[PDB]
Amino acid sequence: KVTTVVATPGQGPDRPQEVSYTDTKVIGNGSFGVVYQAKLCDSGELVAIKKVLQDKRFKNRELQIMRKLDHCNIVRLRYFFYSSKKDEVYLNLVLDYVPETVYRVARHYSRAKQTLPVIYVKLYMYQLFRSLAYIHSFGICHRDIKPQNLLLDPDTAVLKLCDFGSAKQLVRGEPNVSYICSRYYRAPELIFGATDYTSSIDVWSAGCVLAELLLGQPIFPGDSGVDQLVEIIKVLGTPTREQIREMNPPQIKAHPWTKVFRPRTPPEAIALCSRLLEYTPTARLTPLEACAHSFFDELRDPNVKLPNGRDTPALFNFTTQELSSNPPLATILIPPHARI
Ligand SMILES: CC[C@@]1(c2ccccc2)C2=C(CC(C)(C)CC2=O)Nc2n[nH]cc21
Q: Where, by residue number, does ATP bind?
């Protein structure tokens, strides 16, 4: 069975074309709407199709956001199109399919009582920081950074941020809902009900992923709204008066970072963690600063290879958009051996 529709490319000029797909199977049902997998008849490539009922009253936030984005580490919007019998219009987004995710892989290692090799931790986290450096540069905050939303090709080690259904252009001045992100990854501002939060919530979240990958399980598996802060405090100790005020306007000592992770955990991984998982939002590294961190130096080694022996994926092909927030870091990030 073959399905043919008139779809507008996601990035590229706004002129529709006949697009044809087959082998359509439901592999999802969510907040957004339904997700299908399918095969494009031209290329034979695999794709995800998210179908969402859209009132023609409203413009769709996710679509508006996805059209702005082109990056090696972000799931591409290939096409979009509409479909229908009560005068219901459905928006279909047609996206890169990627077979696995960081959740699934991390779970295989955990269910076999093992650690994911630090090299993949470097690769994945590095590429996660790029994807966030790039989206924050438009003032788009993901608001749902977690391992289930990190697509992963196991052969190439290419990581791709997906699911922008919670994402949003942040506008200084306009309040934003506080009960956002999954709990375990939720920044403490948000727990405290802040409505004036920054894209740095994604960085706290990314810090939670890093730690999870080092530990083999989520670092802050809290109970509720407010117990989630208790779990945080178990590790970071009680925040000081200033730290609270910087987040938004019960006493335990800070458990030393070193003693959180199993021993023989690289000290620079723990250093990075401690600079992401900060109470004070502004005290957290920028995504770009985080890519610059010493933890990722092995990637800037010119001999660095995948375990399976192949070349690393694209790590340095930075754009000016992407370098926006601090261009002098280009000197550290693009290392000598790769220019022309
Ligand atoms: C098909 C949709 C999916 C996804 C959707 C939302 C978050 C993460 C991934 C997804 C997979 C493989 C999967 C993890 C087995 C199932 C699945 O939900 N790969 C994808 N590529 N593009 C979108 C996807």
A: 27-35, 50
